[PDB]
Design a protein around this ligand. Structure first.
Ligand SMILES: O=P(O)(O)OC[C@H]1O[C@H](OP(=O)(O)OP(=O)(O)O)[C@H](O)[C@@H]1O
Ligand SMILES: O=P(O)(O)OC[C@H]1O[C@H](OP(=O)(O)OP(=O)(O)O)[C@H](O)[C@@H]1O
Ligand SMILES: Oc1ncnc2cn[nH]c12
Ligand SMILES: Oc1ncnc2cn[nH]c12
Ligand SMILES: [Mg+2]
Ligand SMILES: [Mg+2]
Ligand SMILES: [Mg+2]
Ligand SMILES: [Mg+2]
Lengths: 194, 187
């Protein structure tokens, strides 16, 4: 990748970690007696970024016999930029009610936690049986509001990461690996956009 | 897979065919001058079934250096027996305009093509540079309106398939494989 300063995680590494994480989620939900049709774990995929993690994670969950039901929502905050707008926009909410169900929000990354905080305060009022979160990437020290995800695949530095669903101006989401975008690349774009 | 009467395609077989299709798409757009930011191949993933096919496809397209832009759309029925035309309510449309861009709609399966045909025409009226569709499975004999997909991973008969994004009552989308639902289950 010419635009990458460096590769954080290759596809195999990501695959390996998602497996371990799905195994834990399976052990943790064993006592809930999740079952298809009547008691699936509701996975809430936060678009656009969570699309790839969600696809690979539901399969790893399936490997461990954890029955799921997918809900796709869409929330926007960064837009074409590199930093939080300070605003979280709900572009698409769940199709069904989460009341009484075990819900697990699936996110690609958490930084300021404005997004997950907005989501949690919205969904908690809906009375789900339980509400947890799994984030592929966590920038621990980037919080503007506190938030502790239930499952973190990896902690990372505050630099701008792309690939595997993560974008910079709706680009690079397709990469198989997670990489650090060179500031010179995004700066040229930010400039051209300005 | 106790709930399945038969295995259609294993994860491996699916994986291989998507690569072939992706190489095809790549070659077909070789002269179109695709570039990130300014001229990407816009993928319009039709939720919810194509979510898995799209994740794998965009990565396959990436293997062939085809720069893509992911869009996800969510549609809904207006209310049963209200349209012949396959008209659907748009709950979520493309974030950017497709006008002037090369567009590829991504679907998991097409049978009646009622909705896919409506979606196709809709985006067509938005004046994209080009518009094609890629569907994972094609039940060619089930059409209720004429429609051809430009790229197809596999043609299949009218069996009820599940897995790899495809569901039966919102169940089984997470399977790595595509299998046929036991009629005993769907009864
Ligand atoms: O913790 P925060 O600071 O809120 O940052 C995390 C959010 O920002 C990104 O989404 P974005 O708003 O860019 O939307 P996207 O998923 O469509 O790319 C990321 O995918 C998270 O949803
Ligand atoms: O060509 P057709 O005869 O319409 O059949 C195929 C279409 O319908 C199904 O989606 P569904 O309505 O089940 O939505 P979903 O993808 O969210 O499951 C399937 O996912 C395709 O969209
Ligand atoms: O590094 C990063 N890459 C992509 N999106 C975001 C959001 N927060 N920080 C990001
Ligand atoms: O066989 C099939 N499996 C899953 N969804 C659909 C849509 N049309 N036909 C289907
Ligand atoms: Mg996001
Ligand atoms: Mg983003
Ligand atoms: Mg569908
Ligand atoms: Mg369906």
């Amino acid at each position: 990748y010419e635009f990458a300063e460096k590769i954080l995680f290759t596809e195999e590494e990501i695959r390996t970690r998602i497996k371990e994480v799905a195994k834990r989620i399976a052990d943790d939900y064993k006592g809930k007696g999740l079952r298809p049709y009547v008691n699936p774990l509701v996975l809430i995929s936060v678009l656009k970024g969570s699309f790839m993690f969600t696809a690979d994670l539901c399969r790893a969950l399936c490997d461990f016999n954890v029955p799921v039901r997918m809900e796709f929502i869409c929330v926007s905050s960064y837009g074409e930029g590199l930093t939080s707008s300070g605003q979280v926009r709900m572009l698409l909410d769940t199709r069904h009610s989460i009341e009484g169900h075990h819900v697990l929000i699936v996110e690609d990354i958490v930084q300021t936690a404005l997004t997950l905080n907005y989501l949690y305060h919205m969904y908690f009022t809906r009375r789900p049986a339980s509400l947890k979160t799994v984030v592929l990437l966590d920038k621990r020290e980037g919080r503007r509001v506190p938030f502790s995800a239930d499952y973190v695949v990896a902690n990372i530095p505050n630099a701008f990461v792309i690939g595997y669903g993560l974008d910079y101006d709706d680009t690079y989401r397709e990469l198989r690996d997670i990489v650090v975008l060179r500031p010179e690349v995004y700066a040229e774009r930010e400039a051209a956009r300005g």
